[PDB]
Design an enzyme around this catalytic site. Structure first.
Site, PDB file in Angstrom:
ATOM      1  N   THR A  10       0.872  -1.427  -0.012  1.00 27.44           N
ATOM      2  CA  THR A  10       0.076   0.011   0.028  1.00 27.44           C
ATOM      3  C   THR A  10       1.274   0.782  -0.006  1.00 27.44           C
ATOM      4  O   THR A  10       1.326   1.597   0.409  1.00 27.44           O
ATOM      5  CB  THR A  10      -0.841  -0.025   0.977  1.00 27.44           C
ATOM      6  OG1 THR A  10      -1.712   1.018   1.478  1.00 27.44           O
ATOM      7  CG2 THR A  10      -0.185   0.241   3.016  1.00 27.44           C
ATOM      8  N   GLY A  11       0.474   2.423  -0.146  1.00 27.52           N
ATOM      9  CA  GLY A  11       1.377   3.056  -0.622  1.00 27.52           C
ATOM     10  C   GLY A  11       2.086   3.454  -1.797  1.00 27.52           C
ATOM     11  O   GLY A  11       3.135   3.914  -1.031  1.00 27.52           O
TER      12      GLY A  11
ATOM     13  N   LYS B 179     -12.653   0.157  -8.798  1.00 30.63           N
ATOM     14  CA  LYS B 179     -12.029   0.486  -7.506  1.00 30.63           C
ATOM     15  C   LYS B 179     -12.945   0.009  -6.914  1.00 30.63           C
ATOM     16  O   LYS B 179     -13.265   0.385  -6.092  1.00 30.63           O
ATOM     17  CB  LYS B 179     -11.838   1.399  -6.982  1.00 30.63           C
ATOM     18  CG  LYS B 179     -10.906   1.504  -5.797  1.00 30.63           C
ATOM     19  CD  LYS B 179      -9.439   1.539  -5.806  1.00 30.63           C
ATOM     20  CE  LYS B 179      -8.897   1.084  -4.120  1.00 30.63           C
ATOM     21  NZ  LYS B 179      -7.311   1.955  -4.430  1.00 30.63           N
TER      22      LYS B 179
ATOM     23  N   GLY C  28      14.149  -2.049  -0.861  1.00 28.71           N
ATOM     24  CA  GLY C  28      13.568  -3.980  -0.408  1.00 28.71           C
ATOM     25  C   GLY C  28      11.741  -4.234  -1.601  1.00 28.71           C
ATOM     26  O   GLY C  28      12.309  -5.409  -1.663  1.00 28.71           O
ATOM     27  N   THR C  29      12.653  -3.326  -2.490  1.00 33.75           N
ATOM     28  CA  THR C  29      11.363  -3.338  -3.433  1.00 33.75           C
ATOM     29  C   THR C  29      12.181  -4.822  -4.094  1.00 33.75           C
ATOM     30  O   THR C  29      10.444  -5.719  -5.038  1.00 33.75           O
ATOM     31  CB  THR C  29      11.802  -2.144  -4.582  1.00 33.75           C
ATOM     32  OG1 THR C  29      10.333  -2.427  -5.641  1.00 33.75           O
ATOM     33  CG2 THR C  29      12.766  -2.385  -5.716  1.00 33.75           C
TER      34      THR C  29
ATOM     35  N   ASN D  97      12.471  -8.284  -3.699  1.00 30.49           N
ATOM     36  CA  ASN D  97      12.661  -8.610  -2.723  1.00 30.49           C
ATOM     37  C   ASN D  97      10.687  -8.590  -3.173  1.00 30.49           C
ATOM     38  O   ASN D  97       9.744  -9.909  -3.144  1.00 30.49           O
ATOM     39  CB  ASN D  97      12.757  -8.915  -1.030  1.00 30.49           C
ATOM     40  CG  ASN D  97      11.939 -10.068  -0.351  1.00 30.49           C
ATOM     41  OD1 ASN D  97      11.989 -11.220  -1.113  1.00 30.49           O
ATOM     42  ND2 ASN D  97      11.139  -9.634   0.538  1.00 30.49           N
TER      43      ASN D  97
ATOM     44  N   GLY E 219       6.181   3.805  -9.884  1.00 30.86           N
ATOM     45  CA  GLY E 219       5.283   4.627  -8.904  1.00 30.86           C
ATOM     46  C   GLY E 219       5.643   5.975  -8.413  1.00 30.86           C
ATOM     47  O   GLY E 219       5.114   6.885  -8.999  1.00 30.86           O
TER      48      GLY E 219
ATOM     49  N   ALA F  52       8.551  11.319  -9.588  1.00 32.92           N
ATOM     50  CA  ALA F  52       8.049  11.782  -8.554  1.00 32.92           C
ATOM     51  C   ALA F  52       7.089  13.142  -8.260  1.00 32.92           C
ATOM     52  O   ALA F  52       7.573  13.980  -9.158  1.00 32.92           O
ATOM     53  CB  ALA F  52       9.479  11.749  -6.830  1.00 32.92           C
TER      54      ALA F  52
HETATM   55  O1  LIG Z   1      -3.515   0.638  -0.343  1.00 33.78           O
HETATM   56  C1  LIG Z   1      -4.526   1.203  -0.794  1.00 33.78           C
HETATM   57  O2  LIG Z   1      -5.759   1.133  -2.113  1.00 33.78           O
HETATM   58  C2  LIG Z   1      -5.146   2.505   0.068  1.00 33.78           C
HETATM   59  C3  LIG Z   1      -5.224   3.555  -0.849  1.00 33.78           C
HETATM   60  O3  LIG Z   1      -6.443   3.167  -1.461  1.00 33.78           O
HETATM   61  O4  LIG Z   1      -5.106   4.687  -1.566  1.00 33.78           O
HETATM   62  C4  LIG Z   1      -5.882   2.382   1.668  1.00 33.78           C
HETATM   63  C5  LIG Z   1      -5.736   3.696   1.675  1.00 33.78           C
HETATM   64  C6  LIG Z   1      -6.575   3.381   3.451  1.00 33.78           C
HETATM   65  C7  LIG Z   1      -5.779   2.055   3.012  1.00 33.78           C
HETATM   66  C8  LIG Z   1      -4.753   1.754   2.107  1.00 33.78           C
HETATM   67  C9  LIG Z   1      -5.472   0.123   1.455  1.00 33.78           C
HETATM   68  O5  LIG Z   1      -6.582   0.144   0.899  1.00 33.78           O
HETATM   69  C10 LIG Z   1      -4.765  -1.307   2.768  1.00 33.78           C
HETATM   70  C11 LIG Z   1      -4.362  -1.110   3.234  1.00 33.78           C
HETATM   71  C12 LIG Z   1      -3.488  -2.039   4.355  1.00 33.78           C
HETATM   72  C13 LIG Z   1      -3.221  -3.155   3.690  1.00 33.78           C
HETATM   73  C14 LIG Z   1      -2.604  -4.425   4.128  1.00 33.78           C
HETATM   74  N1  LIG Z   1      -1.679  -5.505   3.692  1.00 33.78           N
HETATM   75  N2  LIG Z   1      -1.498  -6.140   4.446  1.00 33.78           N
HETATM   76  N3  LIG Z   1      -2.066  -5.674   5.677  1.00 33.78           N
HETATM   77  N4  LIG Z   1      -2.342  -4.400   5.569  1.00 33.78           N
HETATM   78  C15 LIG Z   1      -3.942  -3.172   2.558  1.00 33.78           C
HETATM   79  C16 LIG Z   1      -5.287  -2.391   1.563  1.00 33.78           C
HETATM   80  O1  LIG Z   2      18.151  -6.742   6.234  1.00 32.50           O
HETATM   81  C1  LIG Z   2      19.257  -7.085   6.681  1.00 32.50           C
HETATM   82  O2  LIG Z   2      19.870  -8.084   5.982  1.00 32.50           O
HETATM   83  C2  LIG Z   2      20.162  -5.934   6.816  1.00 32.50           C
HETATM   84  C3  LIG Z   2      20.901  -6.068   7.794  1.00 32.50           C
HETATM   85  O3  LIG Z   2      21.905  -6.959   7.733  1.00 32.50           O
HETATM   86  O4  LIG Z   2      20.460  -6.003   9.626  1.00 32.50           O
HETATM   87  C4  LIG Z   2      20.677  -4.732   5.420  1.00 32.50           C
HETATM   88  C5  LIG Z   2      21.852  -3.817   5.921  1.00 32.50           C
HETATM   89  C6  LIG Z   2      21.986  -2.970   5.611  1.00 32.50           C
HETATM   90  C7  LIG Z   2      21.215  -3.576   4.452  1.00 32.50           C
HETATM   91  C8  LIG Z   2      20.515  -4.468   4.389  1.00 32.50           C
HETATM   92  C9  LIG Z   2      19.821  -5.571   3.430  1.00 32.50           C
HETATM   93  O5  LIG Z   2      20.463  -6.856   3.683  1.00 32.50           O
HETATM   94  C10 LIG Z   2      19.623  -5.775   2.356  1.00 32.50           C
HETATM   95  C11 LIG Z   2      18.654  -4.810   2.083  1.00 32.50           C
HETATM   96  C12 LIG Z   2      17.183  -4.325   0.920  1.00 32.50           C
HETATM   97  C13 LIG Z   2      17.382  -5.512   0.280  1.00 32.50           C
HETATM   98  C14 LIG Z   2      16.262  -5.656  -0.803  1.00 32.50           C
HETATM   99  N1  LIG Z   2      15.631  -6.531  -1.587  1.00 32.50           N
HETATM  100  N2  LIG Z   2      14.686  -6.305  -2.251  1.00 32.50           N
HETATM  101  N3  LIG Z   2      15.632  -4.900  -2.862  1.00 32.50           N
HETATM  102  N4  LIG Z   2      16.162  -4.657  -2.119  1.00 32.50           N
HETATM  103  C15 LIG Z   2      18.283  -6.995   0.620  1.00 32.50           C
HETATM  104  C16 LIG Z   2      19.027  -6.962   1.640  1.00 32.50           C
END
Ligand SMILES: O=C(O)C(C(=O)O)[C@@H]1CCC[C@H]1C(=O)c1ccc(-c2nnn[nH]2)cc1
Ligand SMILES: O=C(O)C(C(=O)O)[C@@H]1CCC[C@H]1C(=O)c1ccc(-c2nnn[nH]2)cc1
Lengths: 227, 226
Positions: free
Chosen positions: B12-13, B38, B145-146, B148, B170, B199
């Site tokens: 989300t977001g 939606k 993190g993206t 993974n 996004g 952005a």
């Molecule tokens: O993301 C979207 O669509 C957003 C939007 O409408 O802008 C919504 C805005 C309010 C909450 C978010 C949502 O809908 C949402 C939030 C958390 C989760 C979630 N998933 N796993 N744990 N929590 C799932 C959906």
């Molecule tokens: O998370 C962990 O282990 C942390 C730790 O050492 O504590 C590490 C601290 C430095 C980066 C992070 C990492 O190792 C990591 C960061 C991003 C990704 C990633 N995944 N998808 N896109 N990017 C994968 C690994």
């Protein structure tokens, strides 16, 4: 051998290291011998050193590393930036197997989340878990979005028949908001929630961390991990 | 019928709504008729109304929804808080199928990520995509993190034989940075990156947003969608 448990998470910064330390502490207090290994560590130029942190928090002395990369990036990117290579799959497995011993809990801490590449080509902690017949403990947050990421991670584990040892909430707020409370209830319907570590646990001194760790986990579950 | 695409995200977001708007705008400018659905919207107490945003940014008029919950929570939690159930699976699938028509691109915007419950009991956008035979466009971030989260989402699509139509970043930062640049290269090794929206694009007026959108997507890919 003993019990090997990979400790993964839904992502980076979710509490993998503090959970490793907390389970290590709880197991040591139960008289279980513990080793922790971090086969791939990035961010060492920023001071990131998860093995050292586990030693500091939990008293673990049996700490094992393999690859260390300076930049705080995903392993493949950190290796590329340093002009280094990722380790080979069998090197990660060798590190873990050298630690494994009857009566010992060996925790294998991943880098980032479950499907992060740790070795070429596209070898992940999931593949490593298959190689060493380990179950996977999954660290999750209590924050908005955690349920989707947790279900994605558990489905990925099941796809390769890697058993899920449970979930741990890496940081549990006090008091919990509506979202955190709702997420904890929903997480517990997806899998066993083994612990929810209080927020700020990584800032506790050795004695307070030990007490937090013993209270955080079910003693029968920790004792049951290793025969 | 036409082409149905579900638009999901790694979470989300991450920019699902602005990507829906951007693809809708690019498609409209290619002469394609666009509807956006939606089915479930949460967070309406503070003013969230993603269909209204798509209408303002892209000019879409066929804007279809079924349920609106005030609390900014996952649909199941927002419904529980309100004391009312989520819509039925049949409602969502039939609404989408009814929107679909030859010559039309129908975008179905999820709430949160792919495995979020949208209908009783435990029905997700992935299930809906199977039912209406839609491929999935996956909105991702450029941030740490993206990779993974993207790989996890793609594996989940493949597990139920839902085709991936590509990724959209996004929000593309300015200036990018080493992590964002590295991630953009790595994401393209996982799937086609169809666009990376600058952005701040969600704040553009309709004319500026249309210009951004037409330049963000390959015109041949958009035209090929229908
Ligand atoms: O993301 C979207 O669509 C957003 C939007 O409408 O802008 C919504 C805005 C309010 C909450 C978010 C949502 O809908 C949402 C939030 C958390 C989760 C979630 N998933 N796993 N744990 N929590 C799932 C959906
Ligand atoms: O998370 C962990 O282990 C942390 C730790 O050492 O504590 C590490 C601290 C430095 C980066 C992070 C990492 O190792 C990591 C960061 C991003 C990704 C990633 N995944 N998808 N896109 N990017 C994968 C690994």
């Amino acid at each position: 051998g003993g019990t090997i448990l990979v400790v993964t998470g839904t992502g980076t910064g979710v509490g993998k290291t503090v959970v490793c330390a907390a389970l290590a502490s709880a197991a040591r207090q139960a008289g279980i011998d513990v080793a922790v290994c971090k086969p791939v560590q990035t961010g060492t130029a920023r001071g990131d050193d998860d093995l050292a942190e586990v030693g500091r928090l939990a008293g673990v002395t049996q700490l094992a590393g393999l690859a260390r990369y300076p930049q705080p990036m995903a392993p493949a990117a950190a290796a590329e930036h340093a002009g280094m290579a990722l380790p080979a799959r069998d090197q990660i497995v060798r590190l873990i197997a050298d630690l494994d011993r009857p009566g010992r809990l060996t925790l294998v801490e991943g880098a980032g989340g479950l499907l992060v590449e740790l070795a070429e080509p596209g070898v992940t902690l999931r593949d490593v878990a298959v190689d060493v017949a380990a179950a996977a403990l999954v660290v999750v947050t209590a924050d908005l979005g955690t349920l989707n990421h947790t279900k994605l991670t558990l489905e990925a584990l099941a796809a390769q028949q890697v058993s899920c040892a449970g979930l741990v909430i890496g940081s549990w707020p006090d008091p919990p908001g509506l979202v955190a409370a709702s997420n904890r209830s929903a997480l517990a319907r997806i899998a066993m929630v083994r612990a929810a570590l209080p927020a700020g646990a990584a800032s506790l001194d050795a004695g307070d961390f030990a007490a937090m760790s013993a209270a955080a986990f079910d003693r029968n579950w920790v004792a049951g991990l290793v025969g």
